Amino acid sequence: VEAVYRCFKCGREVKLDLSITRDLRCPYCGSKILYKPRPKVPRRVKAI
Amino acid sequence: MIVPVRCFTCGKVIGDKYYEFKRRVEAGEDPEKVLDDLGLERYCCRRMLLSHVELIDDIMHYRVY
Amino acid sequence: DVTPDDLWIVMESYWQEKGLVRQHLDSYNAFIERGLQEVVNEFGGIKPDIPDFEVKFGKIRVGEPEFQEPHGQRKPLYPMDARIRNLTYAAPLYLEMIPVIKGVEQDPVEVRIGELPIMLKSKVCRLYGLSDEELIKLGEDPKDPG
Ligand SMILES: [Zn+2]
Ligand SMILES: [Zn+2]
């Protein structure tokens, strides 16, 4: 299923699917490296 | 990397006095007089302000998302 | 007379002008400048099992660090990408071949004989001569000695 990713260099938003994409590319700047962004869910951290 | 909030030994809050101390010392004032003015008599507190490094600016430029 | 506190000023300029790893960069730069040509001139040329044709070697040229993408063309490469993508920070190596027909020379031809790994911050690396701002923009620590 389609997922959300962020570019390594330009930090923009890039959407693609790994199971189908035969060539990972950032369409805005051509970077071959992408990040997986933090999910938007709350997490609990103990302050100890 | 940023200034500690409290002195490690006695727990006194010294987090907010670092920038004041740095700016006053850069102006050429006597560091001992500045520290006495700020109200740090025990050397345990003075060490935290004297030996600190501000590395947050150096490490801030690389982002991870 | 002078004082040790004065000689310290002179001594500091030594590490200021010259880095702490000069014994690597100087040797590698000398290698790039002369050693390739010397080792090529040692061999001289190639004489295969041919009646009247042989090739004598020419100059050696090394280009900028580049990488041939499997799905695209040759692209500029930077150390961060190389050490993230498990690549090898190397640059193309170019050699000129002079063909000789029956004792006369023909037009030179330049070919790619391989890739040579590049020592960081050397005279051919992409990080050479860059300011701290540029290195920051490239994802590098400006205090790295290479
Ligand atoms: Zn991008
Ligand atoms: Zn204290």
The Cα–Cα gap between C90 and C114 comes to 10
The Cα–Cα gap between C139 and C79 comes to 9
The Cα–Cα gap between A48 and A30 comes to 43
Q: Could you tell me which of C106, C108, C124, C105 has the C-alpha nearest to residue C116?
A: C124
Write b or e for each residue in B21-59: b if 16 or more Cβ atoms lie within 10 A of its Cβ, otherwise e: beebeeeeeeeeebbeebebeeeebbebbeebeeeeeee
Long-range contacts, C46-53 (Cβ 8 Å, 24+): C52/C101, C52/C102, C52/C103, C53/C99, C53/C100, C53/C101, C53/C102
Tokens at C49, concatenated = 């099992």
CB under 8 Å to A15, separation ≥6 — which residues? Answer: A2, A3, A4, A5
Amino acid at B61: H
Q: How was this structure obtained? A: cryo-EM
Alpha helices (runs of H) in B1-65, residue ranges in sequence order: 18-26, 31-38, 43-50, 56-59
- HSE toward the beta carbon, residue C118, CA cutoff 13 A: 26
Q: Could you tell me which of C85, A24, A26 has the C-alpha nearest to residue C77?
A: C85
Q: Could you tell me which of B63, B45, B57, B65 has the C-alpha nearest to residue B2?
A: B57
State whether residue A25 sits within 8 Å of chain B by CB: no
The neighbour count for residue A40, using CB atoms within 10 Å, is 5
Distance (Å) from the C-alpha of residue C25 to the closest C-alpha of chain A?
29
Tokens at C145, concatenated = 């000695």
Phi-psi domain of B33 (left: phi exceeds 0; alpha: psi -120 through 50; beta: other): alpha
Write b or e for each residue in A18-33: b if 16 or more Cβ atoms lie within 10 A of its Cβ, otherwise e: eeeeeeebbeeeebbe
Question: Tokens 């390594």 appear where?
Answer: A8
Residue B39 vs residues A42, B12, B32, B46: alpha-carbon distances, Å: 41, 11, 11, 10
Tokens at C36, concatenated = 């390739």
The answer to whether the CB atoms of A33 and C85 lie below 8 A apart is yes
Q: Which of C74, C81, C137, C140 to mutate to test the interface with A (most CBs of A within 10 A)?
A: C81
Tokens at C102, concatenated = 């029956």
Q: Are C57 and C44 in contact (CB under 8 A)?
A: yes
Helix axes B43-50, B31-38, angle to 10 degrees: 120
Question: Tokens 């001992």 appear where?
Answer: B32
Residue A8 with chain C: CB contacts under 8 Å: 84
Helix axes B31-38, B18-26, angle to 10 degrees: 150
The answer to whether the CB atoms of A22 and C71 lie below 8 A apart is yes
The Cα–Cα gap between B52 and B34 comes to 16
Residue A7 labelled as part of a binding site: no
Question: Tokens 């000069």 appear where?
Answer: C22
Q: Are C120 and C130 in contact (CB under 8 A)?
A: no
Q: What number of helices (H) and strands (E) belong to chain B?
A: 4, 0
Tokens at B11, concatenated = 């727990």
